[PDB]
Design a protein around this ligand. Sequence first.
Ligand SMILES: CC(=O)CC(=O)SCCNC(=O)CCNC(=O)[C@H](O)C(C)(C)COP(=O)(O)OP(=O)(O)OC[C@H]1O[C@@H](n2cnc3c(N)ncnc32)[C@H](O)[C@@H]1OP(=O)(O)O
Ligand SMILES: NC(=O)C1=CN([C@@H]2O[C@H](COP(=O)(O)OP(=O)(O)OC[C@H]3O[C@@H](n4cnc5c(N)ncnc54)[C@H](O)[C@@H]3O)[C@@H](O)[C@H]2O)C=CC1
Ligand SMILES: NC(=O)C1=CN([C@@H]2O[C@H](COP(=O)(O)OP(=O)(O)OC[C@H]3O[C@@H](n4cnc5c(N)ncnc54)[C@H](O)[C@@H]3O)[C@@H](O)[C@H]2O)C=CC1
Ligand SMILES: NC(=O)C1=CN([C@@H]2O[C@H](COP(=O)(O)OP(=O)(O)OC[C@H]3O[C@@H](n4cnc5c(N)ncnc54)[C@H](O)[C@@H]3O)[C@@H](O)[C@H]2O)C=CC1
Ligand SMILES: NC(=O)C1=CN([C@@H]2O[C@H](COP(=O)(O)OP(=O)(O)OC[C@H]3O[C@@H](n4cnc5c(N)ncnc54)[C@H](O)[C@@H]3O)[C@@H](O)[C@H]2O)C=CC1
Lengths: 242, 244, 242, 242
Amino acid sequence: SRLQDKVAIITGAANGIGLEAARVFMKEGAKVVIADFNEAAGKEAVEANPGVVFIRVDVSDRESVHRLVENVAERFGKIDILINNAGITRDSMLSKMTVDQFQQVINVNLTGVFHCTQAVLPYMAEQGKGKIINTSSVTGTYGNVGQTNYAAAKAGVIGMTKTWAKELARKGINVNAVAPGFTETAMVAEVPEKVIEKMKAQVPMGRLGKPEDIANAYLFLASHESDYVNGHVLHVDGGIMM
Amino acid sequence: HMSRLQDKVAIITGAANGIGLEAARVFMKEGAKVVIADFNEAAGKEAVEANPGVVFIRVDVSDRESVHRLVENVAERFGKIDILINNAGITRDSMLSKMTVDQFQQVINVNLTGVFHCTQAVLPYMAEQGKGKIINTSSVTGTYGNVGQTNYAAAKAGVIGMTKTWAKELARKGINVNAVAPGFTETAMVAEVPEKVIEKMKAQVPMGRLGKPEDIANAYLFLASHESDYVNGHVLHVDGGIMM
Amino acid sequence: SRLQDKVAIITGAANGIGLEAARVFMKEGAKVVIADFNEAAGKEAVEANPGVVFIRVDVSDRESVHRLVENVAERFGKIDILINNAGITRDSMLSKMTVDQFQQVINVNLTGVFHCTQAVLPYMAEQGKGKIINTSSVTGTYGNVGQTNYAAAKAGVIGMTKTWAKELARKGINVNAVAPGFTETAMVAEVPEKVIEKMKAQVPMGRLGKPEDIANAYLFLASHESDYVNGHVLHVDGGIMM
Amino acid sequence: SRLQDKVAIITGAANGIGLEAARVFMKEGAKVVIADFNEAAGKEAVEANPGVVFIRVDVSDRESVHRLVENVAERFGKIDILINNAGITRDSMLSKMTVDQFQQVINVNLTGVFHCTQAVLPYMAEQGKGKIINTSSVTGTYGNVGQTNYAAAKAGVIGMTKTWAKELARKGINVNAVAPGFTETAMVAEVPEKVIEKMKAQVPMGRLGKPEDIANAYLFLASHESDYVNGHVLHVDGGIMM
Ligand SMILES: CC(=O)CC(=O)SCCNC(=O)CCNC(=O)[C@H](O)C(C)(C)COP(=O)(O)OP(=O)(O)OC[C@H]1O[C@@H](n2cnc3c(N)ncnc32)[C@H](O)[C@@H]1OP(=O)(O)O
Ligand SMILES: NC(=O)C1=CN([C@@H]2O[C@H](COP(=O)(O)OP(=O)(O)OC[C@H]3O[C@@H](n4cnc5c(N)ncnc54)[C@H](O)[C@@H]3O)[C@@H](O)[C@H]2O)C=CC1
Ligand SMILES: NC(=O)C1=CN([C@@H]2O[C@H](COP(=O)(O)OP(=O)(O)OC[C@H]3O[C@@H](n4cnc5c(N)ncnc54)[C@H](O)[C@@H]3O)[C@@H](O)[C@H]2O)C=CC1
Ligand SMILES: NC(=O)C1=CN([C@@H]2O[C@H](COP(=O)(O)OP(=O)(O)OC[C@H]3O[C@@H](n4cnc5c(N)ncnc54)[C@H](O)[C@@H]3O)[C@@H](O)[C@H]2O)C=CC1
Ligand SMILES: NC(=O)C1=CN([C@@H]2O[C@H](COP(=O)(O)OP(=O)(O)OC[C@H]3O[C@@H](n4cnc5c(N)ncnc54)[C@H](O)[C@@H]3O)[C@@H](O)[C@H]2O)C=CC1
């Protein structure tokens, strides 16, 4: 199998894209650690998918991340794949956005990616092998009304991805990003039915993404089938016009 | 290997050598019915001998009549065309100051117009099926430019413009259209440079190596399979993170 | 004057964007040669703008281009600026596009840029200075339904631009491109008004480009104020969503 | 006098690129406010460039920023142009980068841009006109070894730029970014001569940028000559290969 015996930490994997990625990765032979702040959802994933491991983490909290990685290393002795998939939104027009809304999103969606990647790095470096996959967004690449903070963070993730691809290549580590288009998860759940049709109208394929579509891109970037893909932003967005 | 392309009919242009040949092999292992479509008869025949189950049909992608002969033959034999990979390509390198009109036009004819001919030829089959995958081979030279390659850069960048247009036009027909931009990859196309300049292009790749045909073939497989169904209008770089 | 005594060849300058660029460049002190196939429009430009020079050219015809450049060189002794602005559209859905429609647009919009640039190059190389400005399009960068051929050509122009920036830098020559968004010229005059509103709807600024807007970008890229801009695609598109 | 009587706030303008932009803008008729924390350099700029105004600001301090903007509005009655040019580096390989280094750079180079833009916005919205120019970097667009934090911030600036172009367009405000290549300022000063040659080797033009080159791009994006340029990242990098 494509990920046989590989240990994968997937942040934000108690729900949505990350949860589906956990399942896909398990089907491909990986040992999967769901690292998520949502305990109830995490425990539900454990019950639903025999063999998956759940460890509670707040990716914005460096101590929490340190504990996560130590825990995984103690259990499995290695960390082969990190998917930085955890994210939040705190949408507001620029004219109304509070510092708290801005900083919260930076903390989770940008700094959290920094924390998790720094924490796994010494394990991958020792192994001389690793895959890091960072979740950006079409909002990061193209901008989006009401998302100053989320765009800042998701674009920032790309800058880090490109830097790390350059820094870590000599260590046998691949670093890439995925830019999902609008995808049917809880993150889209609270948007009005009206804007949903507008979002679909911007996609020539005429549909939103599914968690499985994005999980499939994570799988490509985590497997040997992408070994010469490095520093790339893989869009999975239906060809959205944005 | 899996069976991700089970019973899918794939035409891969330029598949008698290099990246295309490896893609033919990978696609066969994944269950596809593969047609190698290449101008090089001898290489095509050798590929068939070395890879039982593969079909070779000679084509010149720059010649529209040749392209229609190819596609009608594939349709007659297999009844459908699920995947087209526009992988055939040539180089006729020259500094701008010395480049002849023939060098420019030959590369446009094969690397740009040929992609147009093949895509137009397969389109009615895919439209009737309500499904299809088109994968166009661009290059880091198309995205970034490269000294001595005015013509090849024009063609490979042009391929991206067509890819993005087709992704918009054809999505409603159930067709995905994407491009791959390989970095420098170990094939005959690269073998014609001094190993001293090989280190130079290698030095621009943080991974410290050139691509292998299998690397590019693996990206073709991703873009041809259901695992990339929501990838559309995208240029997938397989270039080791090259600085260009 | 930003272009004082600079000799500028502007292809396609008998109408539209190129005509306004000719006027803008004249105001900034340049000696301007309008090179266009439309003889009547060219002669009209000469009458309306005392001092402009018109030389008929078909940019797709190499011999025509060589006569143009010989004529300019014999007359002014130098060529400082080339703007490859001539272009045509022959739109069709892929399913219906003829080889002739495809090839004509390639001939003018892609090969013509090759011809003109190759012809001016020896002059710029001998002087150790020059500015080449190539006109691409948002259709080249983003694709556009009905424009397989135009997108091929305009994207191809970007590939050549980047190649030439690398090749010619050592000769003291800057090479850049402009990607106009939808702009009010004869090229848009044939689209239905309903489509005009659709085009505008994609532009957050809520208006189309003016010939002067694009001419202003040509001026920037032709002047010393862009001496360290090289190999760049300058979008003048109102932030169009495409 | 392309900027005649326009009020421009240029953050970080006590030194380097910003200082040269202050000088260029004054020459073009602008009323320039240098906003910088470096008091000795700011005062020197005033003495050396009569007509310029210096107001002390720390862009990472929201209160300091609001005092700045209130001061400018009270004195000049309007704010026409904001250049978010202030920036710092705190370089380190990922393996050794501290949270302090990461956060300091985010605070100044990303959050500071948010603070300054939010603060000027109500004035530009009232005027129905304004120009916002954000300074990114080739490190943000391409990544650079040792610059995880700076790449995150400078890429994030592009995300915000694109979002703001979309949000603010119909208010008569242009929002664009500049991505300078390596440029001769104090930011590059303590780079070894051997590494300087390495950077030059990646630039086909064979030289680093000058502060005047970047200032000229700021001038383009601040003037009416770029009124239809929106949401664009203007590279001024000599065609660097990165
Ligand atoms: C990229 C893909 O998608 C697949 C491909 O095409 S495979 C490889 C791509 N092709 C290439 O890179 C070009 C290969 N051919 C060449 O390089 C040859 O130089 C040429 C045929 C273009 C010209 O030959 P030539 O007229 O004899 O000029 P030549 O003496 O070789 O080189 C002149 C200068 O340009 C430089 N140069 C040439 N090709 C270059 C390149 N690709 N990149 C950077 N510099 C280059 C050389 O270093 C040389 O520098 P100097 O003057 O300081 O010595
Ligand atoms: N759904 C969409 O349209 C798009 C989503 N993305 C990104 O895809 C990623 C996954 O999101 P979705 O599956 O769509 O939403 P989701 O809500 O289903 O999943 C997000 C998960 O992240 C977890 N999480 C949030 N903050 C956390 C923290 N501080 N520490 C640990 N875990 C935390 C949540 O608990 C949740 O389980 C995110 O990074 C999101 O920004 C990107 C583009 C589009
Ligand atoms: N090797 C490299 O570094 C890179 C190659 N590419 C592209 O990848 C593709 C495959 O090239 P390679 O495998 O590297 O080279 P290759 O030379 O090994 O294979 C090219 C094949 O195309 C065939 N071909 C050429 N002209 C043809 C025509 N008119 N009609 C039908 N077939 C024709 C050749 O006969 C040959 O078998 C090309 O499009 C090339 O431009 C892109 C980036 C890098
Ligand atoms: N108007 C628009 O929305 C956009 C236009 N562009 C490009 O801007 C450029 C200027 O176009 P416009 O001013 O809008 O159109 P235009 O139709 O007003 O001007 C085009 C000029 O090119 C000339 N021309 C055409 N073929 C020629 C040939 N073979 N040789 C010499 N001259 C020739 C025409 O006679 C005409 O005067 C073109 O390259 C066009 O593709 C790019 C993006 C948007
Ligand atoms: N020099 C280069 O190679 C490049 C520089 N940049 C950017 O260009 C901009 C200008 O930098 P340079 O002129 O090169 O460097 P510089 O060091 O000469 O000038 C930076 C100025 O910003 C000020 N500053 C720093 N933090 C501040 C704060 N919290 N509040 C107020 N002022 C503050 C400094 O006091 C200084 O005067 C920066 O944003 C930098 O990141 C981007 C790409 C290349």
